[PDB]
């Protein structure tokens, strides 16, 4: 069943957890681009390509978390309309749909999205028995392109003064 105060509390918890995960994962990217530069200085290149695939996935994850933080703050702003109306607003449909979409995709790191999506499905069970395309691309379980990887290596080599040769 839908409880409004539970949904408000869990949206604030999602905001706080996503802020902490953004800070922590940007610091982990700082830590790991140095070891990608260490692999490039040691000479192993395909190893550095796979580590770059890891860090590209982490950076897409950070941008996905700031998109979801934007949408949860939008629900905290329009929570009066949420608690008042019974029909889903057009300004809320994108946010509610992509949070219900992204909550199984981010079940591990943010455990309050499961509760937020359960409350939103209980609120709009009449509609759900839309989703942001850029957010779906950032949550997509798909390997990044090789030119993006090579380009990523180029700027790592430029920052850490390591000679690297692309394809």
């Amino acid at each position: 069943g839908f409880k409004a105060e539970r949904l408000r509390v869990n949206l604030r918890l999602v905001i706080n957890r996503l802020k902490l995960l953004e800070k922590k994962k940007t610091e982990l990217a700082q830590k790991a681009r140095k070891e990608i530069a260490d692999y490039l200085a040691a000479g192993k290149d395909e190893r550095a390509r796979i580590r770059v695939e890891h860090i590209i996935r982490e950076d897409y994850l950070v941008e996905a978390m700031e998109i979801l933080e934007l949408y949860c703050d939008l629900l905290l702003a329009r929570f009066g309309l949420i608690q008042s109306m019974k029909e889903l607003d057009s300004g809320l449909a994108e946010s509610v749909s992509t949070l219900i979409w992204a909550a199984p995709r981010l079940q591990s790191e943010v455990a309050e999205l499961k509760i937020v999506a359960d409350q939103l499905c209980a609120k709009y069970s009449k509609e759900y028995g839309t989703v942001n395309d850029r957010l779906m691309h950032k949550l997509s379980v798909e390997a990044p392109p090789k030119i993006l990887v090579e380009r990523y290596l180029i700027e790592i080599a430029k920052n850490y003064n390591v000679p690297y040769e692309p394809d």
Binding site: R6, V9, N10, R12, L13, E112
Partner: protein, 50 residues
């Protein structure tokens, strides 16, 4: 054990109750000081303080 006996929802409720009870206590001390001034108005004329 501590994070199952005191969830983040229980922390949020406890902190909202903390903040609202200090709001009510500040209202209490405000009307207390209002009475404590009105009782002893005759020893502090406003013109003498001015």
């Amino acid at each position: 054990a501590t994070l199952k006996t005191m969830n983040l929802e229980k922390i949020s409720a406890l902190m909202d109750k903390f903040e609202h009870q200090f709001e009510t206590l500040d209202v209490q001390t405000q009307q207390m000081e209002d009475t404590m001034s009105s009782t002893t108005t005759l020893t502090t004329p406003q013109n003498q303080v001015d």
